[model samples]
Target: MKQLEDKVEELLSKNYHLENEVARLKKLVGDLLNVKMALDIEIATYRKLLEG
Candidate 1:
């Protein structure tokens, strides 16, 4: 007895959690990179103050 419709539904139900976690980590990475870039700017400004 091969009921593909039932099996297919289980797969869909599982997909949501997978995609949500992907988004969760993506946001984490986005925040980290944003702070990293700001840190770089801070160093650049510090360099300018000493150089000039």
Candidate 2:
């Protein structure tokens, strides 16, 4: 327990920064994929309309 005191604050800070960074990056990827799927859905609808 006593041995970890040297890095306790550093560990907390690193964890805090990691969450802040990964959340935004994860959201960015999620948003891009979502838009692509929407576009694909729209394209399929248009194609069906054209064929019918």
Candidate 3:
């Protein structure tokens, strides 16, 4: 029972770090997606100019 409680506390601490990491990764992915979208628009514009 004591061992189990220790494990639970360890897990809770690890989970806190994991949650922060998840938030950071989420923000990183969001920024990447926004950059990707902007690049896609630029590519489309270049393609249109080339075609014309």
Candidate 4:
């Protein structure tokens, strides 16, 4: 029972770091998605001009 309690405490401490990392990664992905969408629009505009 004492060992289990220790393990749980360790997990809880590690979980804080993991949660922070997840939050950062989520924001980075969101930024990347926004940039990708902007690039797509720019590329499409250029393609239309060149073809027409």
* Best candidate (score: TM-score): 3
List TM-score per model, in order. 0.61, 0.56, 0.82, 0.79
lDDT of 2 by residue, 1-52 (tens): 8569858988999999999999999999999999999999999999999999
User: Can you write out model 4's per-residue Cα lDDT over 1-52, one digit (the tens) per residue?
Assistant: 8999999999998999999999999999999999999999999999999999
Over 4 Å off, model 1: 1-13
Q: What ranking of all candidate models by TM-score puts the best one first?
A: 3, 4, 1, 2
lDDT of each: 0.93, 0.95, 0.99, 0.98
CA shift of 23, model 2, Å: 1.1
Candidate with the larger lDDT of 1 and 2: 2
Candidate 3 residue pairs that clash: none
* CA lDDT, candidate 2, residue 12: 93
lDDT of 1 by residue, 1-52 (tens): 4589888888888898899999999999999999999999999999999999
Q: Give the C-alpha miss distance for residue 2 in model 3, angstroms.
A: 3.4
Regions more than 4 Å wrong, model 3: none
lDDT of 3 by residue, 5-31 (tens): 999999999999999999999999999
TM-score, model 2 to reference? 0.56
The total of clashing pairs for model 3 equals 0
The residue-level lDDT of candidate 2 at 44 comes to 100
